[model samples]
Target: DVQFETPLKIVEYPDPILRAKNKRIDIFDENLKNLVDAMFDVMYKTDGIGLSAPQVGLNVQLMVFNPAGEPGEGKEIVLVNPKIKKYSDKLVPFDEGCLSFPGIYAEVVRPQSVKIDARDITGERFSISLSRLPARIFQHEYDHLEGVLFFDRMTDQVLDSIREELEALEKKYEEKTGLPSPER
Candidate 1:
């Protein structure tokens, strides 16, 4: 588990913000930059491959992904309101996890490569063509902005079988805070 700093707060399940389809970012502000930095810090602390704004309780259309950047090179990429603009014809399956979901991991298939257009922290636009793990990370984070989770794409059977475990976790979260579990 990871912890947020004094200024950062993660939106857990049952928080409407987590499921919100965030608005596209059109204005660049100091607060947005701060959110980006804090997201990296939270992602690194939580052992996540990427962090989305919604996960950190913000409904802003932004995410930061650095599969290999938590310990280094996270600054090399700062994706602002990124989307998968294009991709290669090939597709592949990969194991995916979320800091929000904690221990649950699922196999989700996506395009093997992708092209994304995004803005840097300074609001400069750039395009990137990515492959392998980076491409997977990009897709995963992009999904968050659209209110999609790795489990959402999972078949009903898999979810039904894991219902107990899922409920157990939700129950635990509920017990801790007295909030109800979200309807599936």
Candidate 2:
């Protein structure tokens, strides 16, 4: 297994923490840099190119992604308080997975490009447009900041297919965390 250790771990679905409200990042300091590194470490171990604060149980509007999906390669696309200003009409459907919903996969229809207004780790504000796979990756991680999950938009039939996997995750959650599954 690819490995690196971090204090933060991905919080699975139906964990109340995943649904918690996220606050915007106003401080850009060493703490932010360390958290970004920790987030990237987790992403690397999971073979995940995308991650958000919410997925790791920290409710902040921050996300990190590296298009190359490798250490020390490609630009690390870090976005804080990102707002999708527009989505290109070229909608594309692709299979997707979540670090939270490990072992589960499904198709998700999303846009081919997106325009974003966001801040960087240093609190530097800017706008950038992304296209293709990286664009898709951005959308996926961006959702978590809004308390949304990938499966939430799956087709009804698609939802049916993953129902059991979700149940398993719920049970696994309680077993791992020793906390009750969400009340809903």
Candidate 3:
């Protein structure tokens, strides 16, 4: 078992990969482990509670998260090819932020709990029931694998409130990357 030193950078919004669904991972190898290790570093570096492969520019259904947001502080979870079997009907709106969106945070409506089947880094499938913040984190990262942004989960009023911030972020992206991001 070797550690990966290569840093994984979080891609901001308007990056097209964050706009598209990532493919499921079928191959499990040391490379996958290393990628996950790098992802945790990026997540920790950015003080993020969770992160997805798409956020790091990989079009694969993988995510690493630690709700405690620090090394050895929380249960570090790595989910691969996750599938939600079901979710609670009780919806709750919680303010959330994304690593990809940088400084934006908004209340997102989501189910209170979920039961999901997912493969681990070793390619072994496991089932888990998540509630509260754990459920929220799972759904958040899972949305990334599906190419859905937290912005999409916002209500019309909430979207309006953040519209200017979103625009400003896009402007910065264009200034640096040279493309006005494809139409949403």
Best by lDDT: 3
lDDT of candidate 2 over 9-124, digit per residue (tens): 88888798677888888888878888889998889888888999888878888899997888898778888889999999978898998888887899999989999999887778
Model 1 spans > 4 angstroms off:
1-7, 73-76
The 10-residue segment of model 2 with minimum total lDDT is: 1-10
Candidates 1 and 2: which is better by lDDT?
2
| Total clashing pairs in model 1 | 0
The C-alpha RMSD of each candidate to the native structure, in angstroms, is 3.7, 4.0, 2.4
lDDT of each: 0.74, 0.85, 0.88
Better of 1 and 3 by TM-score: 3
Candidate ranking (TM-score, best to worst): 3, 2, 1
lDDT of 2: 0.85
Highest-scoring model, TM-score: 3
Q: What is the lDDT of candidate 3?
A: 0.88
lDDT of 1 at 108: 75
Q: What lDDT is obtained when candidate 1 is compared to the true structure? A: 0.74
In the range 9-113, model 1's lDDT, one tens digit per residue, is: 556554556677888777777766776788777777776778788888767778887867556855435688786789989879876777777677767778899
Candidate 3 lDDT, 114-165, residue by residue in tens: 9999999889999999998999999999999999988988999999888988
Better of 1 and 3 by lDDT: 3
Candidate 3 local lDDT, residue 118? 96
